[PDB]
Symmetry: C3
Subunit: 488 residues, 3 copies
Amino acid sequence: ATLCLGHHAVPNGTIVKTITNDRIEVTNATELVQNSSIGEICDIPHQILDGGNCTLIDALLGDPQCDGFQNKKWDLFVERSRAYSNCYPYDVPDYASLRSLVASSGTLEFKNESFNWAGVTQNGKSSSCIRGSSSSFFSRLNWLTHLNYTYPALNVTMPNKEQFDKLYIWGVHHPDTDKNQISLYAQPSGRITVSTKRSQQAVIPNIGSRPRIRDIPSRISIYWTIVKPGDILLINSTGNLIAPRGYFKIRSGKSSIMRSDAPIGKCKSECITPNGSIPNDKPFQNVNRITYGACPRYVKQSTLKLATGMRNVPEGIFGAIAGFIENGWEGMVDGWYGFRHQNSEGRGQAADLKSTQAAIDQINGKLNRLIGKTNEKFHQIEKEFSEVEGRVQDLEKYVEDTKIDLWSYNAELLVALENQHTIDLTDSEMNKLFEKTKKQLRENAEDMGNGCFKIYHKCDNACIGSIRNETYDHNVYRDEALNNRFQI
Amino acid sequence: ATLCLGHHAVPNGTIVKTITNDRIEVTNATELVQNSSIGEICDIPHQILDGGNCTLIDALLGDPQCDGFQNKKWDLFVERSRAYSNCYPYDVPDYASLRSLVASSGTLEFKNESFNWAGVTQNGKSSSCIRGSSSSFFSRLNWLTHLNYTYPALNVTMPNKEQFDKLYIWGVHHPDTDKNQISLYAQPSGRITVSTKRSQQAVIPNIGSRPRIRDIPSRISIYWTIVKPGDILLINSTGNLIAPRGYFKIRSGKSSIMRSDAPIGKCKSECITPNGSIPNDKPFQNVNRITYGACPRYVKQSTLKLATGMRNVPEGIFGAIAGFIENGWEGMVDGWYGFRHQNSEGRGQAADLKSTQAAIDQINGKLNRLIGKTNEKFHQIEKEFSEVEGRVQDLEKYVEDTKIDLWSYNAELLVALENQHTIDLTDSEMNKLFEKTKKQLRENAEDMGNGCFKIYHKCDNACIGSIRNETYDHNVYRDEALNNRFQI
Amino acid sequence: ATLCLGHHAVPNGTIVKTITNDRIEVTNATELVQNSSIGEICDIPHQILDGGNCTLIDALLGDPQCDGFQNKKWDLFVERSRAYSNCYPYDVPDYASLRSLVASSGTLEFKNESFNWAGVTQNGKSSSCIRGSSSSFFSRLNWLTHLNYTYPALNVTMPNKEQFDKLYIWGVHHPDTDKNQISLYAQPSGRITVSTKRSQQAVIPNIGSRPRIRDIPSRISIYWTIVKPGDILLINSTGNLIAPRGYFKIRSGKSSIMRSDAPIGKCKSECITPNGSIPNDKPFQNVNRITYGACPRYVKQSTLKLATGMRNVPEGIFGAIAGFIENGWEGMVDGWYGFRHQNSEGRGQAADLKSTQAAIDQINGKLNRLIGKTNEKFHQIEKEFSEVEGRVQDLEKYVEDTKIDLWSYNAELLVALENQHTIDLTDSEMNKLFEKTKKQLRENAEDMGNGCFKIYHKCDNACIGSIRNETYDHNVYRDEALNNRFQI
Ligand SMILES: CC(=O)N[C@H]1[C@H](O[C@H]2[C@@H](O)[C@@H](CO)O[C@@H](O[C@H]3[C@H](O)[C@@H](O)[C@H](O)O[C@@H]3CO)[C@@H]2O)O[C@H](CO)[C@@H](O[C@@H]2O[C@H](CO[C@]3(C(=O)O)C[C@H](O)[C@@H](NC(C)=O)[C@H]([C@H](O)[C@H](O)CO)O3)[C@H](O)[C@H](O)[C@H]2O)[C@@H]1O
Ligand SMILES: CC(=O)N[C@H]1[C@H](O[C@H]2[C@@H](O)[C@@H](CO)O[C@@H](O[C@H]3[C@H](O)[C@@H](O)[C@H](O)O[C@@H]3CO)[C@@H]2O)O[C@H](CO)[C@@H](O[C@@H]2O[C@H](CO[C@]3(C(=O)O)C[C@H](O)[C@@H](NC(C)=O)[C@H]([C@H](O)[C@H](O)CO)O3)[C@H](O)[C@H](O)[C@H]2O)[C@@H]1O
Ligand SMILES: CC(=O)N[C@H]1[C@H](O[C@H]2[C@@H](O)[C@@H](CO)O[C@@H](O[C@H]3[C@H](O)[C@@H](O)[C@H](O)O[C@@H]3CO)[C@@H]2O)O[C@H](CO)[C@@H](O[C@@H]2O[C@H](CO[C@]3(C(=O)O)C[C@H](O)[C@@H](NC(C)=O)[C@H]([C@H](O)[C@H](O)CO)O3)[C@H](O)[C@H](O)[C@H]2O)[C@@H]1O
Ligand SMILES: *[C@@H]1O[C@H](CO)[C@@H](O[C@@H]2O[C@H](CO)[C@@H](O)[C@H](O)[C@H]2NC(C)=O)[C@H](O)[C@H]1NC(C)=O
Ligand SMILES: *[C@@H]1O[C@H](CO)[C@@H](O[C@@H]2O[C@H](CO)[C@@H](O)[C@H](O)[C@H]2NC(C)=O)[C@H](O)[C@H]1NC(C)=O
Ligand SMILES: *[C@@H]1O[C@H](CO)[C@@H](O[C@@H]2O[C@H](CO)[C@@H](O)[C@H](O)[C@H]2NC(C)=O)[C@H](O)[C@H]1NC(C)=O
Ligand SMILES: *[C@@H]1O[C@H](CO)[C@@H](O[C@@H]2O[C@H](CO)[C@@H](O)[C@H](O)[C@H]2NC(C)=O)[C@H](O)[C@H]1NC(C)=O
Ligand SMILES: *[C@@H]1O[C@H](CO)[C@@H](O[C@@H]2O[C@H](CO)[C@@H](O)[C@H](O)[C@H]2NC(C)=O)[C@H](O)[C@H]1NC(C)=O
Ligand SMILES: *[C@@H]1O[C@H](CO)[C@@H](O[C@@H]2O[C@H](CO)[C@@H](O)[C@H](O)[C@H]2NC(C)=O)[C@H](O)[C@H]1NC(C)=O
Ligand SMILES: *[C@@H]1O[C@H](CO)[C@@H](O)[C@H](O)[C@H]1NC(C)=O
Ligand SMILES: *[C@@H]1O[C@H](CO)[C@@H](O)[C@H](O)[C@H]1NC(C)=O
Ligand SMILES: *[C@@H]1O[C@H](CO)[C@@H](O)[C@H](O)[C@H]1NC(C)=O
Ligand SMILES: *[C@@H]1O[C@H](CO)[C@@H](O)[C@H](O)[C@H]1NC(C)=O
Ligand SMILES: *[C@@H]1O[C@H](CO)[C@@H](O)[C@H](O)[C@H]1NC(C)=O
Ligand SMILES: *[C@@H]1O[C@H](CO)[C@@H](O)[C@H](O)[C@H]1NC(C)=O
């Protein structure tokens, strides 16, 4: 009889990378880089708020377009690129910081407070800000002006008797002219001091024409202040104050904001990107560096294939597969390793289950460490910028670029080591089954060197089966075998 | 005779992770993550300065509570969370930067300088700042006011004739009212310009009530300026100047500051955390991301076990351990690998020293690369924040979170590769001792397949010993062995 | 006959590090850390602009020294440490940001625009700024002052009808005295508002003596503003305006700036450092963390040797090299593995080509992954600082230090894993050639255990050659061999 040890092969293998080889074919691999989105943001499990035409900041101030956003909450606020401001023209010094802190607070919940604006007109309006047919203003702000050509210095307080922090949004009006300055606040100067036991902010208006927006050459600047529990807001002004009508709760949670034009859909997905949700089964993704939720890590590579089978040899350090075994057996489809024999009763093929299962368990082990293991991230840094800003933006970008190169490196190295190891462990399993069989045969057979043993005795099907199920008793055939082997 | 090769096992193994296995038992492991502190800051080798009730900044300005800190130096300044300000109410725009640069300078050494404050009253005092029973002020600052209802414009210089940089601390007073403005500085305006050949800073006071602190509704703002050698300080003011009384040396060294409530103790420890000192023998730690000194790197994992022994098989790619050798020998306690025999004189067990020492040396090699190898870090970035700040704080936190995920990744991968390698190299040593023995026996013995040889000749204790010490001469027994082996 | 399998050795090996060994000798290694520069900046392929005596900013404003830089472009602008300002004394709030954004724009291209400066004197001059024998000014700036003791409020526009962004550089003059204030701008106040539909910047001068520079106690502050296509610049001022004479194009490309005192040379090199160009064949470098172009990654290690040959054993997990083969063959110089024999015709040595080529191909595979693979980087963050700045600088440095430790870690681990693997794969190749030969010999030879076979039949040179070329037919000699082997 002849008993040959072998392993399977497939007609259609896959190319992977190892430590030593850019391009080597295995029987099977799996992709570790997610490269597509379904192109929609799934609305489960994260609570999504579609900004539509409104920026977060405009929803905050109460631009008329944004009245539907009053007191809303979100896990992720989605800002659309078509969003536009449609109220009094304003800027926010350190706009990105205000956006950021509201985003991660995750709420626009507002509470009215009663201020003693003694001696001034309230509820200033503008046709740059139309609410319902008429001149209006930011819903959360209170434009104060002269009453009877008098603007009597303001000096109001508001203790924080609450358990939580209050966020106050206020402003300063910059009139285009000294004339408008006078006719608005009956006063040439105009000064604002807003303070607490912990902080002070002081602002003087800057008079001058700015280019007209909805016919307004004047401008408002927006500021904010956080009042801790037991502290006190004190607003001391003699003109130009755009006053708050109350406070926002400021919370600390996992909320964020993302710029995206992707539609919201009724589906479930843990990981969100501007492009849409992406599955998070893979450890890496190449869809977008901007992400929210439990997401694969962003890498530069568009693909990284993890070998999930042995080297494919159609028809490693252990020397068996692609070694002393000339090639794989495509006809073996019920196992990874097995036996072909020829004896007096014919020629046959049988899978070896234990060795097949050993290789598969090791590979499944690798997969369990790498698949469905992603990390959860929420409010991050900004990663795209529409305007040159210099030093801080240079650092923001450098930090992300650094991080991405390091992860891309981790990904490349991980797959190469794992693949080299997969090829070696599968080669080893082959070598181990061969060795175990050789030992079973003792003096009754000889290694032909091509993975085949010549067995020097009659070995019928039951005899072959006794080898494969490891009950073969070499003593039974020894006399016969030694006589055939050692003749002249 | 029968000669069996084997390896040890222990009743109580340890679970470790490898590339292929989340949970596999070895004979021994070591922990690579430091997870506890002694709960005290050891006062050797770093020179520790306990801030007690004083912030660094208050020690800098000379709050009365902090007189004991005059001219002190430190490697690490420890700020306590109970610290509180107890002098005139002040703020420092960019407070964190001033704190940071004094911290890393490591000295409060001060040098008096004589300024020509011609025509003003000096040494302004407040009951918000009590020194010894009476109204006082920041020791390092000089509150100037009117003399005889005159405040004559100040214009003073101070060349830096020194070899080193000078740090000047100064301020501007913000009176609550135009009345107090007048009664203090006999002047409505008030302006400050402090300049050098290299820089200029200009400040106007902002009049208005802030909430009262120790009954003061006024406030001081603190500023600083660094004067290079050969440069000149020029202070040009017509009111509101809180003047310097001299300069601080500004040094560049390894000094830092840390917020901690841990007590200082008389002991020695290279690595300090807010929780207390931690040993630095391990390469990683999970105690605190804030550290000072030669410290293990912070990771998320609470434990990472490095295998320091073979797979434990009570009673790998090489197929010997947990392979053709059915199990380990718990009765073998003087070696890792060895021999059990049965011959005419009895049954015995002996360790093999060379193979045991080969496995141990390799493992010790790994340990020497990983143990006691920690990296020294001093003044870092801040890693905890008591207040929402936006953009820069978002970047500070993102940088640390990024770094920590990358190191945690490094740690996880390192231990898995090392453990897989440890299991393989110990399996290999087993396989190598088996092969070497088989070769010694030549034609005189046969491999039974379970790590045991059947020796076909009388092999007494000396004979067994000749095998183990590698002096066995197969020629001596060949005739006898061939006759027993190849009979019918 | 005797047939011995062996491998080469060299008299002069190299020490490398592995996972288990700090110091182990191989036949050959290669250096992975570039540690030297040619000490010159090569002027191909990057377009280099030598700043000589001029900072970028001075070339931007048009300091007289810098007239040769008008409208120049660059890939890399090189600033020399001897550079000095020689015009009116000025500062730029956020200087580093302006430098940065011009650097990466890569152009000083300027376009004259005609402003309507109605009612003022133009072309203000100073002896602090000498052009051609006479008092001059920044070429790109326009110092406006009173005309006939009148300074009539300015209010000019300039639409951006272009397709691209415009960068405007402007300033505010700070006179030393209220007197000079009057005599310059016929006005006590002085205010500047520069605005667009997107932004507003407002500046008031700060009067006061600063220390004299080229006899000027006054100072200019420089500001900038970017005007998007379809937007409008509006400059509204009543004094102190240092006006623009036009705009710079602001581009987005790969341009940067570097501080260096290295001379420019006529040579070609992809990677530039302040020290000079460095070859980029190696994956790592220790020359400078500041780099431009396709550059090896900066690491702390001064050397990292990658094994490119087997363990050197003069005269691993597979047990062959430095194992059952007592030592290497220094006399074998045409191959890595081979055969020595003694037969009736003499004693000889022959290389085995297939096994030699297998080891070499694997090693070349590793090298191809690591050599000539460097990554291209352009404008980065700053990495050296001449002045204490606090929080942002602390983050800039912390980010770079973090990155460098992570890459140094990657480098150390990479070389140790690769070297351990190289030693194992070369040991394996040895073991594989031995096994294949043993199998060829079948029952005709015995393993002596030291890598040598005793062949039990007459085996002349052709016979030896049949073994080495794998045509040996064991059946031919079997009878003879069995008779010699199994005699009494
Ligand atoms: C406060 C104000 O309304 N300013 C007006 C301005 O008003 C002048 C005009 O009424 C004349 C004739 O009566 O009188 C001047 O004042 C005299 C006053 O009668 C007298 O009592 C005093 O003693 O002496 C002075 C002499 O100076 C007034 O200065 O007139 C111009 C031209 O009509 C207005 O500009 C136009 O504004 C348009 C936008 O209008 C609003 C808006 O935003 O919708 C109307 C808003 O109700 C008003 N909101 C508030 C709270 O006031 C705002 C607000 O003033 C601005 O937005 C701030 O910039 O303006 C549009 O811009 C058009 O292009 C302008 O020509 C100016 O608003
Ligand atoms: C500079 C000053 O002392 N301001 C006082 C203020 O003084 C007024 C009062 O003396 C009246 C009666 O004489 O006269 C006013 O001035 C007139 C002046 O006599 C006359 O010559 C001139 O021609 O015309 C004016 C008319 O206006 C003075 O304005 O009085 C109030 C009420 O007493 C004081 O407020 C109280 O201050 C308390 C804190 O006191 C200190 C402190 O900090 O401890 C005392 C310090 O010595 C003083 N330090 C210095 C260098 O001045 C400081 C300092 O002024 C403030 O800290 C700055 O804010 O105040 C406490 O706050 C209490 O709640 C207040 O009612 C005010 O200090
Ligand atoms: C604008 C100016 O030139 N300021 C001069 C200043 O001029 C005074 C002087 O002319 C006297 C005598 O005629 O008159 C004063 O004005 C009177 C005026 O005649 C009258 O019509 C009005 O009604 O009443 C006033 C009464 O005050 C003038 O104030 O004189 C001083 C001393 O000479 C000058 O300081 C010296 O400047 C030197 C540097 O000179 C330049 C320069 O930078 O090179 C000359 C430049 O041409 C000038 N550039 C422009 C656009 O003006 C600049 C510029 O003023 C400064 O740089 C801004 O600081 O100065 C040098 O610094 C020397 O150390 C000074 O003593 C002052 O420049
Ligand atoms: C400063 O100049 C601008 C013109 O460049 C003035 O604003 C323009 O005024 C006209 C009619 O009054 C408007 O129809 C334009 O829309 C305005 N232009 C822009 C783009 O804002 C401005 O009024 C001038 N300043 C003063 C106070 O005289
Ligand atoms: C802060 O508020 C108080 C008003 O309560 C201001 O002081 C008053 O201002 C009025 C009108 O300008 C003066 O005529 C009074 O003499 C002041 N009253 C008192 C009690 O002093 C003060 O101007 C405000 N300050 C700011 C920053 O606007
Ligand atoms: C502005 O308002 C506050 C009151 O809200 C004034 O400060 C208070 O004054 C009383 C008595 O004068 C003190 O006992 C309180 O401690 C003060 N309150 C706080 C929390 O600061 C302030 O004086 C007013 N401003 C002016 C100048 O009129
Ligand atoms: C800087 O210092 C000088 C004083 O040495 C100031 O100029 C003087 O100010 C006085 C009093 O206000 C005037 O009456 C004199 O005419 C000025 N003397 C000279 C020599 O010019 C100047 O005001 C100070 N500037 C600042 C920023 O406070
Ligand atoms: C404020 O003081 C400085 C002197 O410390 C004055 O500037 C000096 O003036 C002399 C002669 O006028 C010059 O030769 C020096 O070079 C100046 N010193 C420096 C270092 O700037 C300044 O003029 C004074 N201010 C005023 C307006 O009186
Ligand atoms: C912006 O420009 C306009 C000038 O076009 C300024 O307003 C004029 O200023 C003059 C001179 O000071 C006044 O006498 C006129 O009454 C104003 N003209 C108009 C049409 O209002 C305004 O001062 C400038 N503002 C700034 C910021 O300098
Ligand atoms: C996703 O969005 C980014 C940003 O626009 C884009 O560059 C990327 O190609 C998109 N990718 C996919 C797979 O949709
Ligand atoms: C958003 O604005 C556009 C154009 O101004 C308008 O046509 C559309 O109806 C608005 N959409 C929403 C979400 O109301
Ligand atoms: C150390 O301090 C940090 C910060 O408070 C805390 O979260 C951590 O659990 C503490 N750990 C130990 C081991 O003392
Ligand atoms: C710190 O302040 C507390 C409470 O104000 C006081 O009881 C204690 O004595 C002070 N401790 C020191 C270190 O002086
Ligand atoms: C290169 O420049 C840096 C910065 O001065 C210096 O520290 C380094 O040693 C220099 N190295 C070489 C190899 O020229
Ligand atoms: C640069 O300035 C120095 C010293 O001021 C001068 O000698 C030299 O000629 C200048 N060099 C150039 C590049 O013009």
